[PDB]
RNA sequence: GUUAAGUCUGGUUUCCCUCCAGGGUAUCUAAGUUGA
């Protein structure tokens, strides 16, 4: 969440990442980079890019200058390079963060919520039945990479299976309707 | 009371003519009134059975067969293998639906036989390829609703929710 | 807009009952509360605004300060008044309403219990919660989406509680109506009005001379103009309850309970009720 | 520095409480923070807010101690016991309003002791609405646990 | 249908606070501590959700004769205080 | 080091003594199984203000806290909840003298003033995110040793 | 550095005397960019006596007068009858602040002494007739303003706010 | 008997959450020394 302080443009949510987790995506592209023929040179670069900024908080897609995130931390921008193409697409600015103010944004981008169990023939609460529990929000995004070692059956999988996979279930609390994830392979969205 | 006629709804272009009443009176369960089809039935535990075009009962309650409810009669030269029956319009599993039924239906349902000799193995099917739709659209709706085609621009309207509506289970062969 | 405001109560009084009385009250606050201001010029030189005839009076000369006060009393009375005279109740949606929903709780099962009640004396429910909060200080129950004044379920269930376990123990009670560890049997619908006579609001004061004072030296009567419910307006509200048990302690208690109060200030006789009607709709 | 909803609610209740003299004036300003954002909620920012500053009844001194608490911190709220717990509030939703940048000190100023300016504040505040709703009831509830909690009943 | 940044404020402005009490018995007066609010959503309110079901002879069951005489629930709390009645129109049967 | 449960024991025997009506003791109960998820979630310095609002340090209730350091007789009267209440903040203001977050000779002249009571909560929000991350299992460990001694209400 | 220049919105007509440079330079900080006038400071505590309009100092803070801020030194044959000053900028009570400040606001303001005789006497004003709105709008801004005549077309969105959001507080003796 | 003139006041104070439930159940690991 964010209270865009000087800027026009309303923006209700944005994206957060920090440069921590932008190191641990530039090792996992480094590593894989030589373990196979595989490069990834446009998304190694940008993320590159991103990572000669360190130490001042950045925004991509904007030139926000300054916000409130998670009603409680403020930051100050910086413009990248005159608008850099960011790695995702969905017209919401994606901010990099110092990982300090970056830990504490994203513990309070996390969903706390109290379950509670009633019995079946009273309508009141059980004992013991009360919980807490924690979701990752919807529109979060994870990196990982999927490896397979030279095989026929890794041809026919790479070629037929992985590109008919786009929605699966990841997690658990699959009756709550958690879980539903959309896979977007960065060879053909980068 | 209104003697009704369950005219299945399948690719196969046995379809046009088998209900003798066109309107009868000005009475049909199943509207089309610029929404696109409503009060349209759907029976579960039966397949389409597209070689010679009818529907035999199966047991599975996944195997569902959709299709209209409109007034007629078997043509006094048929129905020795229909089902026909008697419900108080509380038993049908009517989708789409727009208003209230009065009571007392009397349905006839395009039946078939057991014949035991092959086993029945029913497929999911789809109600696209509108070079199918087109015929179904000028030999079931026009011969029943004459309406359409008289005051409607909204056809293709029907087109694509006959793309979004009708689906069916048939015997595979 | 600003001019959203100055064109207000042409609005109360000509959309009448078909304005949204909790934001046309809240608006209307502004102008209250900067009426000095509102009258420098600023009447948006109209004809049926009542703004302008607050400059063709003269109320002092000595004193502009004093000649806005005044003019601000009675700017209050007449809003009171408008309020009153031009937002009358058309019952027709609460009708339907009442009839549907009652028609929702046959297909669960339930037993309804229909009662409709009507106001003997000017009423005060929600006193304390803002409607004319801003302008009057005091304030009715308000309903800001049926724009209707009503009595919460909550207060009629709270008050047919505490007389069934006046007269029936503190145990009986909580085999009705539930305790922290069983839910209650009997369920209440908010009430609303459904047919006035005339008024659906109504003016009134209210003048503490005395209260909190020490002696005659420090005595002064301050005057609270504020609204209250009209006599002769008939609430309905709903019962249902799936056990046939309740059915009776709640009967008996509803005539009993109502005659005396069901609101506000009812120990000087304002919020006096009538049981009109009752009925039961039994299930199964 | 940027100070969050507690931090401004901090200093703000601060300097209020050091120029609120007599105590009835502090317990009437706790009734007040006690229910006014319950109002703000129900009826709205600007017209509660405009209904403060009416129940302030400034058009006294009360107005210029108003503004010398902004930067003395040696001012003292002078009026009744109910017209400066209003003042105070008041006070303490200006300083909100200076500090977030929502609305500069000098047209606060101007529009509270001006009879023409107060209208173009209202347009203001309806032009500004979303930025304040936004937030400022955090800033209010802050307020309303420093009241309930440094001063007592009656 | 407001852009999101002030359609937040009116949507959450939007939301019925009713405060209760509770009462001292013999004093008939407000117990100390004994006054809260609740906030309501609207009558009339609309909710959007999906209910989904994997491949199963017990979910065509369900879905082709519970979920057809399924149109009114309770939800929520303060059921007793008349809230939390719901109708469930399905896109499926009447959009 | 785990001497945080230890500081717990201390704590909890200090409180679970000052609280001589058993109603105290539950309703501190309460607040122990509520407080430490609410700082979890809601971060310290807002649970430290809802905490210290329903706490109602008027002037003699934080006598007997202060006494409550040092004599091990000292007892807080109240309502149960306005001494549970009362009880967790003392607590919290144990742990911070303690772990020497806070001298005491400041949280003592703090405690009988109003005038340094507001800096101390000035310095309390100085040091939240210090604070937050330390107290986390000393506040579990008052919560399990709650729900352990102290009976179900 | 740069020494801006602020002057009324009268009725009356003295202004070419003493107003000399348009901008002197690249850019302003007043502007008309299709979103309204911006940057008007405010005077608050001035009286405008403008029979040859000078401004005249009062004692009430609700007498405000309201202009334009102009770029330039004006006639270079003064300094003696004109209220001088440089402000940092901050301390500058504007309407509509939408970029930044030169940090220093050096401002040469038209000055009448009061000369005690009378009792000064204010009275608000709001003006109108689009005619006497043109007739200042596009001889005096035009004297100023010359990045116009190509895309503040609609003149409209200047005509239409300068008898709403000016006023002052007359003398008129 | 007659003349004139109204004037003063313009909602306050409490209560802002209380109690209980703060995890329960199931899985707790399965399957698999050879050459000099």
Redesign the interface.
Known sequence: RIIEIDSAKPYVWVYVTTYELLKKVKLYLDSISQLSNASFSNLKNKIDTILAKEGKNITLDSDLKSAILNEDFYVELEALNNKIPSIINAGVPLLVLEDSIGREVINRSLIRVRRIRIDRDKKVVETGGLWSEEYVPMKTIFFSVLLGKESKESAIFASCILRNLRYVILGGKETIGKGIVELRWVKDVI | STQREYVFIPITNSITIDVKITIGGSDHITNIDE?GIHNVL?I?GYAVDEKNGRLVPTL???D?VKGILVAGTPQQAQSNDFLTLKLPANKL?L????GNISDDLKIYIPYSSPDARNSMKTKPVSISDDTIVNNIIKEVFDKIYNITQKEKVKIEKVKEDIKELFSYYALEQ | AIDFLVNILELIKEKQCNINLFSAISLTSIVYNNFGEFLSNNQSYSTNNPLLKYHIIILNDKNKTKDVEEKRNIFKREVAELISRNFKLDGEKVRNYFDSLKEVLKSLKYTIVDVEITTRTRALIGVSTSLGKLIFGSGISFDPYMNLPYIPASEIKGIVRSYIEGKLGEQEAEEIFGNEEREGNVNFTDAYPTRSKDFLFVPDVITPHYNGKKSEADAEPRPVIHLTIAPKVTFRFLIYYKREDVGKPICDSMPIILIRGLGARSSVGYSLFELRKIEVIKAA | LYEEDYKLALEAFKKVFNALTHYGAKQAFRSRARDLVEEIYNSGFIPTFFYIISKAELNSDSLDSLISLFSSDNAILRGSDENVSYSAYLFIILYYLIKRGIIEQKFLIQALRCEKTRLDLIDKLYNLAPIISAKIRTYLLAIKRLSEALIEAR
Request: proline residues 8%; glycine residues 0%; hydrophobic residues 15%.
């Open positions: 929404r759907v579960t599975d309650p996944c569902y599993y989708i789409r639906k727009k």
